[PDB]
Motif scaffolding. Sequence first.
Motif, mmCIF file in Angstrom:
data_model
loop_
_atom_site.group_PDB
_atom_site.id
_atom_site.type_symbol
_atom_site.label_atom_id
_atom_site.label_comp_id
_atom_site.label_asym_id
_atom_site.label_seq_id
_atom_site.Cartn_x
_atom_site.Cartn_y
_atom_site.Cartn_z
ATOM 1 N N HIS A 44 0.818 -1.199 0.000
ATOM 2 C CA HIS A 44 0.000 0.000 0.000
ATOM 3 C C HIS A 44 0.853 1.250 0.000
ATOM 4 O O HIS A 44 0.510 2.235 -0.645
ATOM 5 C CB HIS A 44 -0.929 -0.026 1.193
ATOM 6 C CG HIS A 44 -2.112 -0.910 0.997
ATOM 7 N ND1 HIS A 44 -2.866 -0.883 -0.150
ATOM 8 C CD2 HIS A 44 -2.663 -1.852 1.788
ATOM 9 C CE1 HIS A 44 -3.841 -1.761 -0.048
ATOM 10 N NE2 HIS A 44 -3.738 -2.364 1.117
ATOM 11 N N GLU A 47 2.172 1.812 -3.497
ATOM 12 C CA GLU A 47 1.136 2.218 -4.426
ATOM 13 C C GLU A 47 0.606 3.601 -4.140
ATOM 14 O O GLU A 47 0.255 4.319 -5.067
ATOM 15 C CB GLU A 47 -0.012 1.242 -4.396
ATOM 16 C CG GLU A 47 -0.101 0.470 -5.630
ATOM 17 C CD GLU A 47 -0.702 1.272 -6.726
ATOM 18 O OE1 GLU A 47 -0.622 0.834 -7.870
ATOM 19 O OE2 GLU A 47 -1.272 2.339 -6.460
ATOM 20 N N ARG A 50 3.086 5.826 -6.003
ATOM 21 C CA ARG A 50 2.826 5.926 -7.434
ATOM 22 C C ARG A 50 1.561 6.719 -7.713
ATOM 23 O O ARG A 50 1.487 7.447 -8.705
ATOM 24 C CB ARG A 50 2.689 4.555 -8.048
ATOM 25 C CG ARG A 50 3.839 3.679 -7.846
ATOM 26 C CD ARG A 50 3.707 2.489 -8.724
ATOM 27 N NE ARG A 50 4.523 1.392 -8.241
ATOM 28 C CZ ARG A 50 4.044 0.357 -7.567
ATOM 29 N NH1 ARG A 50 2.756 0.274 -7.316
ATOM 30 N NH2 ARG A 50 4.851 -0.597 -7.152
ATOM 31 N N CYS A 51 0.545 6.584 -6.865
ATOM 32 C CA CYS A 51 -0.674 7.351 -7.074
ATOM 33 C C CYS A 51 -0.442 8.826 -6.826
ATOM 34 O O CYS A 51 -1.053 9.663 -7.476
ATOM 35 C CB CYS A 51 -1.802 6.856 -6.182
ATOM 36 S SG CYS A 51 -2.451 5.212 -6.476
ATOM 37 N N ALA A 54 1.146 10.086 -10.061
ATOM 38 C CA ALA A 54 0.221 10.147 -11.177
ATOM 39 C C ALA A 54 -0.898 11.137 -10.962
ATOM 40 O O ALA A 54 -1.740 11.288 -11.838
ATOM 41 C CB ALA A 54 -0.388 8.781 -11.408
ATOM 42 N N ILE A 56 -3.425 10.798 -8.806
ATOM 43 C CA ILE A 56 -4.680 10.076 -8.650
ATOM 44 C C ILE A 56 -5.133 10.193 -7.203
ATOM 45 O O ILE A 56 -4.311 10.055 -6.291
ATOM 46 C CB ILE A 56 -4.529 8.609 -9.048
ATOM 47 C CG1 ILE A 56 -4.303 8.499 -10.531
ATOM 48 C CG2 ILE A 56 -5.758 7.872 -8.742
ATOM 49 C CD1 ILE A 56 -3.869 7.149 -10.954
ATOM 50 N N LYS A 59 -7.880 6.120 -2.436
ATOM 51 C CA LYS A 59 -8.686 5.824 -1.255
ATOM 52 C C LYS A 59 -9.069 4.358 -1.241
ATOM 53 O O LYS A 59 -9.822 3.912 -2.104
ATOM 54 C CB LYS A 59 -9.936 6.688 -1.206
ATOM 55 C CG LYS A 59 -10.555 6.756 0.163
ATOM 56 C CD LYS A 59 -11.555 5.640 0.378
ATOM 57 C CE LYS A 59 -12.587 5.603 -0.719
ATOM 58 N NZ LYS A 59 -13.632 6.635 -0.479
#
Lengths: 111, 42, 42, 56
Positions: A44, A47, A50-51, A54, A56, A59
Amino acid sequence: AKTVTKQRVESHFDLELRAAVMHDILDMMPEGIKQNKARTILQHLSEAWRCWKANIPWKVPGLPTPIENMILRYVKAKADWWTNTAHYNRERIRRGATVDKTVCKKNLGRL
Amino acid sequence: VWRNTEDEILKAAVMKYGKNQWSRIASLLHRKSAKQCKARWY
Amino acid sequence: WKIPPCISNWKNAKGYTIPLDKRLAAVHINENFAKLAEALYI
Amino acid sequence: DTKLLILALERLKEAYSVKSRLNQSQREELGLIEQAYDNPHEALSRIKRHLLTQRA
RNA sequence: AUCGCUUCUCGGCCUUUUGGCUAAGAUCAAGUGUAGUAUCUGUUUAUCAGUUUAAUAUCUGAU
């Protein structure tokens, strides 16, 4: 016991960041007694990063709040480090100090 | 143009690889580029 | 204290199929647009 | 219309003067430019159809 | 009702299961017209008459 020089700055930052995260909650705010899944909270963490990169909104449906606050805190740590490095390298590139050719491309991608 | 066989490959390819590896998927398909696959998906 | 698993859109290390739905899940408009656009038509 | 089209297509060719290693997508563009340089009325029919009907 | 055995059903574990990082690490895919090569694959219709030939064969003619 080799020093941390210039090719191991990033790999070492990530070594120590995820050692810290593993110390932090996944063994000191547990009571997910059985097997506290820390190897999956680290997934988590990667990620979420990376989010961030990006842009993003990240949630996760049912994820205890202490963990979510831990992750948000550490992604803000890495984001501060990342963009402060971008500011620094951009000043070096602008005034003319480095000719290294991986820093030119890494920095264009960051900005 | 798009043929039901192809987009049925694309559903499975997206189901497997993920929603961000368009060049892999594009490689599963003959005569498609990653831009067109991504467009058809979105 | 149960931790959901991560399904990333970038990493599929072991090559696993996940259905589109579970793969997927893991706008405002002001009210002055109306006043501007209608003032322009008038 | 053909003078305006010849000027447009010459300007678009001016990018790949080098005729480099380019790629698939520039390969495809050069294909479109050449076939419109050969058959200039299917081109212009398409162009005006676009200008008339397309908005996304 | 209790004990044991067997059959089917259901719930709970099912972390016992997604190797780390960066500039998603980076990038991208064109074609069968011509020939030939190689490999497999198949082979070395029944008389008789003649032509022919060193002898076969060929050729011609009905089957």
